[PDB]
Amino acid sequence: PKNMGKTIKVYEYVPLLDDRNINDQGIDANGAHIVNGNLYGSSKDIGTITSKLPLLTENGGRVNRVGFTRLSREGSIHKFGFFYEFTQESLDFDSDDQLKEHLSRELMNGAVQITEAVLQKDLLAAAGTVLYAGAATSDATITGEGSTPSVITYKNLMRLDAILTDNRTPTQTTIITGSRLVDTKVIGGTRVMYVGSELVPDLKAMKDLFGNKAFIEIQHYGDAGTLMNGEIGTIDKFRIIQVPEMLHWAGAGAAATDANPGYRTSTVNGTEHYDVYPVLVVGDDSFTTIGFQTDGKSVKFNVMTKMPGKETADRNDPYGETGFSSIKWYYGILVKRPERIAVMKAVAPL
């Protein structure tokens, strides 16, 4: 709402037995004042659980006290906008007669694309599970030429599935049992991946764990299940969607040398650097786009054309021969639960 600031804040009510429920209020099974107050927290160790059980004697008194916490989470709005100018002679002495429309359309399309790109950037930024394919510890160590390169493999996607399941991230789809049509297969994917258009060559050749093809294309299960648009295949537990406009860091990898086996490499200050490509999976109910004054829609553009003539004259132009047209909008997201978004950074083949 208006007259209410430029940020939105929520509450996250941490459960009792969580490793984030820190509180001073805490009493042991003997009346002592133990530091923590979350019993044993998110500890799946047998010793910790056995030691911190809430044993309470038959003449129960003031033992076994536990506290609770609540965590806030914020998110703001940022503005955007761009324009273009046009002399009257440009629209009056031109071979074409619909230049104004052919610029307004070509501007609105660009604005929509910009909104998509900034949403993609924010999603790739706010990722709780930022997972590095291969043997990379940081972005600077995502290489493609060393003894162990950084390429997407079956084990890495298995690890992403494991991490997403452990974070209690929900499934998006259901497994597809077989059909009766020969040469078809059974996909077993419940998550939805969003690879770029450059990892597909490498992602179409992963040799499973036992050197078998690990990319069941869409044609092998179109009969027995629904087909989501943009699909190219399934891998382990990830129904794969190719995103044509997929953002990719360029030069945020390692140093490039002559041993480069054919992986994409950009240039950052002379010496070439490897390019890092993301594999983004966003879970259900992980973010919300706070639309300010945008009724229903996430982003509402405002057109401000002003035709040259008597509506643009001023002391700065006693003749009034120039106009303009501008588009502006507000955009911003609140990542309420940044544990569903996950990314595999990796290189891509040339």
Binding site: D24, N30, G31, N59, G60, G61, R62
Partner: protein, 180 residues
Amino acid sequence: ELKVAFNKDTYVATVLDASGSVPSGSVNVGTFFHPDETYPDSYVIYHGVRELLYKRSEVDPAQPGFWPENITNMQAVTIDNKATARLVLNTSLPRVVSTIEGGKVTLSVVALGGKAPLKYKWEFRAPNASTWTAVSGQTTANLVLDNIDADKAGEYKVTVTDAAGTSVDSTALVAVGAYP
């Protein structure tokens, strides 16, 4: 920290100061911080004494004990605070103090309690800064900013420390109106 001492015979729980003297018979029942570090203005001498006695056996205060047999009937426990009063700030620095270049501003602070020697100290934070440049020569619990100029605008804070060490503080934002 306030040492508590219990005398079962007279059911008296004298709350002495850290450096007190367990009265004849009164056994050290334990100590506690009256201005609870976490929640200062949420607890009183009673709460501390009560808990200190909840963990002491009824048969013998000196001997620790728990719920089954402990001193919990506070109705009888006679608490006699023989400890220094909590340093308080009846009068605190005027939240905001607006003036013009020239108008004298006086910041005042009245502290009651703590150890008798209530020392004062004034610190000043310029606008858009973090360092609290201590106002040199100010120990008076009253800072008269006569003929104030635009530079002397900003936040001014006191620190009433008692001989012991407990310190109560108060801040006042001085705003000076400048003119070409």
